[PDB]
Write a protein that binds this DNA or RNA. Structure first.
Ligand SMILES: [K+]
Ligand SMILES: [K+]
Ligand SMILES: [Mg+2]
Ligand SMILES: [Mg+2]
Ligand SMILES: [Mg+2]
Ligand SMILES: [Mg+2]
Ligand SMILES: [Mg+2]
Ligand SMILES: [Mg+2]
Ligand SMILES: [Mg+2]
Ligand SMILES: [Mg+2]
Ligand SMILES: [Mg+2]
Ligand SMILES: [Mg+2]
Ligand SMILES: [Mg+2]
Ligand SMILES: [Mg+2]
Ligand SMILES: [Mg+2]
Ligand SMILES: [Mg+2]
Ligand SMILES: [Mg+2]
Ligand SMILES: [Mg+2]
Ligand SMILES: [Mg+2]
Lengths: 118, 171, 71
RNA sequence: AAACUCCAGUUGACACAAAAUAGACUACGAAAGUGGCUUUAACAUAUCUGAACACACAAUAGCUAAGACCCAAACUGGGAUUAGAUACCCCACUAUGCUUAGCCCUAAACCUCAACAGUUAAAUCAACAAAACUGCUCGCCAGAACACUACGAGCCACAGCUUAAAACUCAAA
C-alpha cells in the first residue's frame, strides 16, 4: 500500500544529510518499495529533547518519503531505521491522502433526553 | 495463493493494462495491496471453477465459496496468532455456518453440492447423534467392552472347529 | 432492596468455609478413602463385563487403569 | 510516635510499571472487556429460535514454572489509639498486581430488562423500577428455612468448581 515515512534526521551538514537520505531511500527500494516523492520540511527545534543512539538532540531535519511498498516491507524498514545512527525518529504511517474524507451535511442536533438517558 | 504479479480484480479488465509501464503493473498488482485484495482474487477463481453463473453472488454456492475463503483466512491468521480468541471464535462460527449452508445445499441441489465439495475440497460430515462428555470412566469401560467382544468372537470360532473336527471323526 | 437474604447466605458460606478449614485433614483422609472405593467399584464393573460374557480372565493384555488418582 | 538521615533540594542521564487533557464523547466487541503511538492481520451468518453438561470463550482473586520489579499491596512486623483493637490511623516489607507458558472457570459476570418479530389502538397501569402490550421459541420457577449444604457423578480443579436433595422445624417467609 501507500505509506508516508516521517523522518527526523540528525542535524548535519548538506553532504551527510544527502548521504543519509540516499541510504534511507535505497533501503526502501531494497525492500521492494516504489518511492514516489521526497519532501524537505526544514530543520527546526524539536518539540522536546530526544535521546537517540547515545546522543541528545535538540534540532533535527524533518523529511517525508511518500512511497508504495508491500505490507511485509513496513516491519523490515522499521527495523532498519532503528539501527541508523543518523535517524533521530522515524515513523511509517499509512499515507493520509489514500483515506478519502466522507462528506458531511452538518451538525445534527442530539436530543438532551438521550444524553441523560444514555 | 495467486501470484503477487496478479492484477487487482478492479484493474484486470481495463483496456490497455498490458501495455503500461512495469512500475504501473507493480502498483496495480497483489504485491502492493493488502491481503483482503488477494482474497477477492481467490474467491473469483473458485466461483468461475465451481458455480454455473460466476456473477450470481446471492446463490447458496457463492455464499459457501465466499465463506470458505474467509474460513481459510482465519486459519492462516490463527497459525500466527494462536492466542487470538476473537478470531478463533470467528473461525469456529464460520465453519458452523458453512456446514449449515452445505446441509441446505445437499438437501436442495445434490449435483451442485457435489461440485462445491470437490471444488473447495470439503469432506462433508454428518453431525453426531448425541452430545455428551466421554469422560475417563466411559472411555475406559467402552474400550474394555470392545476387548471383551473381540475375545468372545475368537472363542466362538474355536468352538466351531472343535465341533466340526469331532463330527468328522464319527464318519 | 434490603440485603437480608444475602446476609443469610453470607453467614452460611463463611461458617462453611471455616468448618472446612478446621477439618481439612479429616476431610482429606475421608476423600482418599472414597476414591479407593470408587476405584474398586470401577474395577468390579469391568470384571462383571468379561465374566458375564463367558471369559474367565481379563482380555489378554488388559490392565484396568487408575482413573481417579491425582497422577 | 515509629521510620530514614550514603537524607533532602536543583540539574542531567534513565523502565519488561502505568497510560493527564481529549472524554461534556458514548464508540468497538458475543460477553468478559476495550480509551498513549505506529504498522500487519482482522471483526461469522442473504429467515429466525436452538445446550449447567457438546464446542469456544469468560473481570478480579488464586495455582504451577521461569523472568521483570517503579509504584501500590493481603499477610506479617513496628508505631499509635482502645476497657480490649487480631481493626479503623502512620511506617516498612512480602505474596500478588506485569511478562511468558500452562492451569483454575468464579462475580451485585447486573440495563438486576432472555432471542427474534410486531403494535402504539385498546384497559395506560397492583406498587416501585424502565410507558403498556402481542406473536413465536428456548431456558427457568412452584411457601420459608435446612441449602452457594449432604451424597452421587464429572472436572489439569484435591481447603475447589458444576449439578443438587432429604429428615427434623415453622405459619409464615
Ligand atoms: K494517556
Ligand atoms: K448493576
Ligand atoms: Mg445460616
Ligand atoms: Mg442461533
Ligand atoms: Mg448457553
Ligand atoms: Mg438443558
Ligand atoms: Mg456455571
Ligand atoms: Mg478467567
Ligand atoms: Mg495471575
Ligand atoms: Mg512501596
Ligand atoms: Mg499491631
Ligand atoms: Mg513484589
Ligand atoms: Mg505493561
Ligand atoms: Mg460488569
Ligand atoms: Mg436464548
Ligand atoms: Mg422452597
Ligand atoms: Mg459461590
Ligand atoms: Mg459445594
Ligand atoms: Mg462430593
Amino acid at each position: 500500500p501507500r505509506y508516508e515515512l516521517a523522518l527526523i534526521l540528525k542535524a548535519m551538514q548538506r553532504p551527510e544529510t544527502a548521504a543519509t537520505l540516499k541510504r534511507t531511500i535505497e533501503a526502501l527500494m531494497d525492500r521492494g518499495a516504489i518511492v514516489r516523492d521526497l519532501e524537505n520540511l526544514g530543520e527546526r527545534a524539536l518539540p522536546y529533547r530526544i535521546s537517540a543512539h547515545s546522543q541528545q538532540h535538540n534540532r533535527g531535519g524533518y523529511f517525508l518519503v511518500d512511497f508504495y511498498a508491500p505490507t511485509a516491507a513496513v516491519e523490515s524498514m522499521v527495523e532498519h531505521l532503528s539501527r541508523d545512527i543518523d535517524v533521530i525518529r522515524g515513523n511509517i504511517v499509512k499515507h493520509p491522502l489514500t483515506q478519502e474524507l466522507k462528506e458531511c451535511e452538518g451538525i445534527v442536533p442530539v436530543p438532551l433526553a438521550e444524553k441523560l438517558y444514555s | 495463493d495467486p501470484p503477487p504479479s496478479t492484477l487487482l480484480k478492479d484493474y484486470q479488465n481495463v483496456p490497455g493494462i498490458e501495455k503500461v509501464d512495469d512500475v504501473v503493473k507493480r502498483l496495480l498488482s497483489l504485491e502492493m495491496a493488502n491481503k483482503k485484495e488477494m482474497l477477492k482474487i481467490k474467491q473469483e477463481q473458485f466461483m468461475k471453477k465451481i458455480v454455473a453463473n460466476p456473477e450470481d453472488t446471492r446463490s447458496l454456492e457463492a455464499r459457501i465459496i465466499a465463506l470458505s475463503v474467509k474460513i481459510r483466512s482465519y486459519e492462516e491468521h490463527l497459525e500466527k496468532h494462536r492466542k487470538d480468541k476473537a478470531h478463533k471464535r470467528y473461525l469456529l462460527m464460520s465453519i458452523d455456518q458453512r456446514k449449515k449452508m452445505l446441509k441446505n445445499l445437499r438437501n436442495t441441489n445434490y449435483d451442485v453440492f457435489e461440485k462445491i465439495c470437490w471444488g473447495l475440497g470439503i469432506e462433508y460430515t454428518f453431525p453426531p447423534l448425541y452430545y455428551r462428555r466421554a469422560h475417563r470412566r466411559f472411555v475406559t469401560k467402552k474400550a474394555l467392552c470392545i476387548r471383551v467382544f473381540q475375545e468372545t468372537q475368537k472363542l466362538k470360532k474355536r468352538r466351531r472347529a472343535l465341533k466340526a473336527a469331532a463330527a468328522a471323526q464319527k464318519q | 432492596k434490603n440485603v437480608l437474604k444475602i446476609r443469610r447466605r453470607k453467614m452460611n458460606h463463611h461458617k462453611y468455609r471455616k468448618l472446612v478449614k478446621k477439618t481439612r485433614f479429616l476431610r482429606r483422609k475421608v476423600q482418599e478413602g472414597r476414591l479407593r472405593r470408587k476405584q474398586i467399584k470401577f474395577e468390579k464393573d469391568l470384571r462383571r463385563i468379561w465374566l458375564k460374557a463367558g471369559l474367565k480372565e481379563a482380555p489378554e493384555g488388559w490392565q484396568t487403569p487408575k482413573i481417579y488418582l491425582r497422577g
